[PDB]
Design a protein around this ligand. Structure first.
Ligand code: HEM
Ligand SMILES: OC(Cn1cncn1)(Cn1cncn1)c1ccc(F)cc1F
Length: 528
């Protein structure tokens, strides 16, 4: 009776007096035991998707998910089906695989899920305050509208010869090529492509001043800011270490440079239609009348250039890598170049790029097999009912959607693990809406988000850099094809993806051997 409760207190007393050898042992085994008991109890709930069993509390399935996410998804899909949850470094992730998952997450109501609540911890320290995910959604919608204003057909027409010039400059001057001095050589594509991507993106979107600054020690700052863009920042966004200080310094230094150019252009009234800087200076006033600050404009520049940097560089690296073991595809692409550009006598233009279906299909196919973002997250803000199930996703959970996984399923893409650009025959468009449209604030886009092919997502958070990426990748690959042949070192093949980084770039070093199609061909212009 009450004598029982006396022994409760006595037991508590004897608990606190255990040797700290047993106490430490107990504060390990008790959370461990409770974790297992909780999961087994959790599995009784029929309004919750199945939860992947895990031994270590808090950690969850982080190790297997972090290293081989698609293999994790497939095993989980076999056991539980398309909807299942797993614990990830303190968080509960609810995965919804397949097209229905795309609809459930990408077309979720604004009040139901939050992208910025999921990503702000990562991106804000890198890009700066006030923009992208450090603001309400309505602000992001208009920022996208602003950026999209410099991403027009007319802009792409002017970008193409600029991007082309940068590619030829890189072939001429970079130590990785030097085509005027060498006719063959070995490159690491994870060295060349990030460089070619930043040179071409900077020249076209930022302008000649900012491009020129990449020829200096300023370039190291981009590398510093680069290191801040890492999954580690999802768990440890701010540790007092040098990595984080160089990042924060780089952000200030780079945004300061952008603001300097911005204020100079405005003081000289030198505001044209050259680049994204000009565009944002003329067009960055929200609908409620508030103007973006020069800091916010610079930070938006950083975010847009940085994101486009990683997605595009990774993509062109995969293209080169897949093509390295496919001389048949290089050959077919080369013939297309000769036919469309009249044996090379025509100058490449944006309009001529659109008449290169096989080149564009090659980009399209590479993006199928190598979605640079294997997982997209939203934080659940309100309890969500999953249609045609009894499942309820409580607020505090995160939903995870993965079109890249569906890209690699035989059911939706026959022989999915085979690189075949001809699966897109007479369907070379980067993507398109097969029906009704909707405008979230940055232009009419597809209402339905059910396509098995969805490398640019859909819904309010859909990519707006798709046409720029195709323009950039197109020009670049057009010139690679016309200038070089390339192949693997003996016994080398397409490397496995590095799923552990921010984008799922190839595992390096990923080397290819190039050779000039025309050994005698010289690239003009001056250099020291
Ligand atoms: C192959 C190239 C690219 C791919 C595959 C890609 C993919 C994506 C995806 C999947 C999203 C949606 C993320 C989500 O749903 O959470 C997205 C959003 C976005 N991307 Fe891209 N991207 C690429 C290139 C670019 C480029 C070149 C730019 C800029 C020039 C850019 C700027 C943006 C912006 C501003 C968003 C909006 C983010 C949001 O609304 O939350 N992307 N991209
Ligand atoms: O969506 C990203 C952020 N992200 C999400 N998972 C991993 N990285 C990447 N990205 C997508 N297209 C281009 N970059 C992004 C979105 C917008 C942006 F401005 C920067 C940025 F990193």
């Amino acid at each position: 009776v009450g004598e029982a409760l006396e022994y409760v207190n006595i037991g508590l007393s004897h608990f606190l007096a255990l040797p700290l050898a047993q106490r430490i042992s107990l504060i390990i085994i008790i959370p461990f035991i409770y974790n297992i008991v909780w999961q087994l109890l959790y599995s009784l709930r029929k309004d919750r998707p199945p939860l992947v069993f895990y031994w270590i509390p808090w950690v969850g399935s982080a190790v297997v998910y972090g290293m081989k996410p698609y293999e994790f998804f497939e095993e989980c899909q076999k056991k539980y089906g398309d909807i299942f949850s797993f614990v990830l470094l303190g968080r509960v992730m609810t995965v919804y695989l397949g097209p229905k998952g795309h609809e459930f997450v990408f077309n979720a109501k604004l009040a139901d899920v939050s992208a910025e609540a999921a990503y702000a911890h990562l991106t804000t320290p890198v890009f700066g305050k006030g923009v992208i995910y450090d603001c309400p959604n309505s602000r992001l919608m208009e920022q996208k509208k602003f950026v999209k204003g410099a991403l027009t057909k007319e802009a792409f027409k002017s970008y193409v010869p600029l991007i082309a010039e940068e590619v030829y400059k890189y072939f001429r001057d970079s130590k990785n090529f030097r085509l005027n001095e060498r006719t063959t050589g070995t490159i690491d594509v994870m060295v060349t492509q990030p460089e070619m991507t930043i040179f071409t993106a900077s020249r076209s979107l930022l302008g000649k001043e900012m491009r020129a600054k990449l020829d200096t020690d300023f370039a190291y700052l981009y590398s510093d800011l680069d290191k801040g863009f890492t999954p580690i920042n999802f768990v440890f966004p701010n540790l007092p270490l040098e990595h984080y200080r160089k990042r924060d310094h780089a952000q200030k230094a780079i945004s300061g440079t952008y603001m300097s150019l911005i204020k100079e252009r405005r003081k000289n009234n030198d505001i044209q239609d050259r680049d994204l800087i000009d565009s944002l200076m003329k067009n960055s006033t929200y609908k409620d009348g508030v103007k973006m600050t020069d800091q916010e404009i610079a930070n938006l520049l950083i975010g847009v250039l940085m994101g486009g940097q990683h997605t595009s560089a990774a993509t062109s690296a995969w293209i080169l890598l897949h093509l390295a073991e496919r001389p048949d595809v290089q050959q077919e692409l080369y013939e297309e170049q000769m036919r469309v550009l009249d044996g090379g006598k025509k100058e490449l233009t944006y309009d001529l790029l659109q008449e290169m279906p096989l080149l564009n299909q090659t980009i399209k196919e590479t993006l199928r097999m190598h979605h640079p973002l294997h997982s997209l997250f939203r934080k659940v803000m309100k309890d969500m009912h999953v249609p045609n199930t009894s499942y309820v996703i409580p607020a505090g959970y995160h939903v995870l959607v993965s079109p890249g996984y569906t890209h690699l399923r035989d059911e939706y893409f026959p022989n999915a693990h085979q690189f075949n650009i001809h699966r897109w025959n007479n369907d070379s468009a980067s993507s398109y809406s097969v029906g009704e449209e909707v405008d979230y604030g940055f232009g009419a886009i597809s209402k339905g988000v059910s396509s098995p092919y969805l490398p640019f997502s859909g819904g309010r958070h859909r990519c707006i850099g798709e046409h720029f990426a195709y323009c950039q990748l197109g020009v670049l690959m057009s010139i690679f094809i016309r200038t070089l042949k390339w192949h693997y070192p003996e016994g080398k093949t397409v490397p496995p993806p590095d799923f552990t980084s921010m984008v799922t770039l190839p595992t390096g070093p990923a080397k290819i051997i190039w050779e000039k199609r025309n050994p005698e061909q010289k690239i003009g212009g001056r250099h020291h």
